[PDB]
Symmetry: none
Subunit: 354 residues, 2 copies
């Protein structure tokens, strides 16, 4: 029930939202002819369709009409009560569920966004019904469960108490199982995700229930050291070899959280994105197996480079002819039509195409 995967060219997935409306026909064709795997973000097409659920459903139909093999993934945050969903008004009707801290204040991110009590079974029941409405009744093929590291953050202990924290971690396991129970075996569960930092690293997890994990921070944020980059690549290799989907999120030399980089004119962003592609692309191809996908851009809104294309993505790749080879911080991989080399320490990389 995985997306149809191919080595003909670099395997590419999409993950973004266009808030101002559906993809144009030209945008939908551009996307649908270039990938079999897309998650549509919170807010997608809300300006014209009112709710994310409505926008995503109409978009899922458009894309699959163009590419019937496309797997369209419903973005549904596991932890946060985002306002641009019809579901938000239903959650507002259940104040008995609302998470509170040890002092009684409502637990809200940046003081505005409520965080879910995953230990509450009624909530979990409602939350999984939202997902199953999108993927069973609707036209999506799976769900993207965001925010696992936010749930597991030790900082939440100061807010909840240790006992409620353990209850909420248990509730994360519960809500994944119940998600699977409700959407069936033919549907995809994607979650965020694999993460490598100096103090804490999460590998592919909950494997009895989940199908795909994103490596959202590859090469950036707290995951920019050679040690954490190597761990992300090795975990992709290990997880994919064991039959899972892995989506590696590359960043085009900067991210949407870098205020100075985001202030730069579009021409400068494109120069940076072109110069910055080779290294994360070589890292991805060094460790990539079947069912591994690359994403490369600087954010999750359509305009954050998400519809950019690069000639590297059209070049013949072909099946891997040998396993990844590692010597110290240096990695290399042979494909039928390309050779890859990358040094995690110096950030030096080389891709030799046929």
């Amino acid at each position: 029930h995985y997306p149809e995967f191919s080595w003909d060219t670099v395997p590419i997935a999409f993950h973004f939202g266009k808030s101002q409306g559906l993809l144009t026909k030209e945008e939908a064709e551009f996307v649908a002819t270039r990938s079999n795997f897309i998650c549509l973000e919170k807010g997608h097409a809300t300006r014209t369709h009112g709710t994310t659920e409505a926008g995503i459903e109409a978009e899922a139909r458009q894309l699959k009409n163009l590419n019937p093999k496309m797997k369209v993934i419903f973005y549904w945050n596991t932890f946060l009560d985002y306002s641009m969903f019809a579901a938000h008004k239903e959650y507002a009707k259940h104040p008995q569920w609302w998470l509170r801290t040890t002092t009684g204040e409502l637990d809200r991110k940046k003081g505005q966004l409520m965080r879910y009590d995953l230990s509450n079974a009624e909530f979990r029941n409602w939350w999984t019904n939202v997902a199953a409405k999108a993927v069973v009744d609707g036209t999506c093929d799976g769900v993207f469960m965001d925010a696992f590291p936010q749930i597991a953050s030790q900082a939440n202990r100061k807010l909840w108490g240790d006992e409620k924290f353990e209850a909420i971690q248990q509730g994360l396991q519960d809500i994944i199982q119940e998600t699977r129970q409700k959407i069936g075996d033919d549907k995809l569960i994607v979650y965020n995700g694999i993460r490598s930092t100096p103090d804490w690293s999460a590998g592919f997890d909950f494997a009895e229930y989940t199908d795909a994990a994103m490596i959202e921070h590859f090469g950036h944020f707290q995951s920019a050291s050679k040690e954490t980059m190597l761990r992300d690549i090795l975990e992709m290799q290990r997880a994919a070899k064991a039959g899972k989907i892995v989506v590696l999120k590359g960043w085009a030399g900067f991210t949407f959280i870098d205020d100075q980089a985001m202030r730069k004119p579009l021409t400068q962003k494109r120069r940076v994105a072109k110069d910055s592609l080779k290294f994360p692309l070589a890292c991805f191809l060094a460790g990539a197996q079947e069912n591994c996908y690359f994403i490369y851009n600087w954010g999750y809104r359509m305009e954050n480079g998400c519809l950019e294309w690069y000639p590297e993505f059209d070049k013949p790749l072909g099946k891997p002819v040998g396993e990844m080879v590692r010597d110290g911080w240096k990695l290399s991989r042979e494909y039928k039509h390309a050779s890859v080399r990358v040094d995690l320490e110096s950030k030096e990389a080389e891709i030799r195409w046929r």
Copy 2:
């Protein structure tokens, strides 16, 4: 390093030559006040300046003195050994087919061996003399569909053909290296035909592509016109320049049409503008340029003007909308509709 672009009116570029001499005061001012983007063709001003290089250099200085924003592009054929260049005698001082006959287009013009690196270094040196040492702002690299034509496998063999294809990629890369990142590389081009199509290519190095045959030659079908428009839109959204070469109801190759009087030529040119102009506006994005005439010599309609090119246009306020062969587009001061099947067109100026 792009030409300065505006939506105030239809964005216009020029692409022609005047072999009898430089533009006159009036002709120079006409072009300089109406566009920031011109390619000067082979032969320009050769009668009085001897070579295309010297004629284009003198013209580039004249036009830029009138409009300092003017980007002037040097015509340098990527494949063909034209005689009205000083560089022709250097080529003469230094490509074989399988039968040994000299490879000459229509028996006259030699064709270049892009595999040979000595040639490539010379060729790019000629481009660099014109744009780095000289006053031009970039180079127009013609003839890419000729180079790629599969029929050349018959003339050269599969091995040499693929050497030449690689050579084209090498010459483009070597051009950019020698002229720098602040100069423009224009090439011909995007082409859509029923059996063979090329979109924007070599985007690592090139800035601009011409759609030379829009609506005409082998690209007159609704299928190929739509391909051209869609590729303009994609490439310009990707950050490239696109030059759409419209034809004024006929072309310089149609003998009978070319033998008609100017008054009839102008009548047909006026009647034929709305359709190709609406196709361009339907898909146009930033850094898209329209050209409208019946050829590449100054006198082939190239300094004709139309009120449509003075009308307020304004920024696009919506995306191209396509239903079947029908396109529409909303600008701040005009609504566009065109039907590629019936060739009906409306430009509702406001």
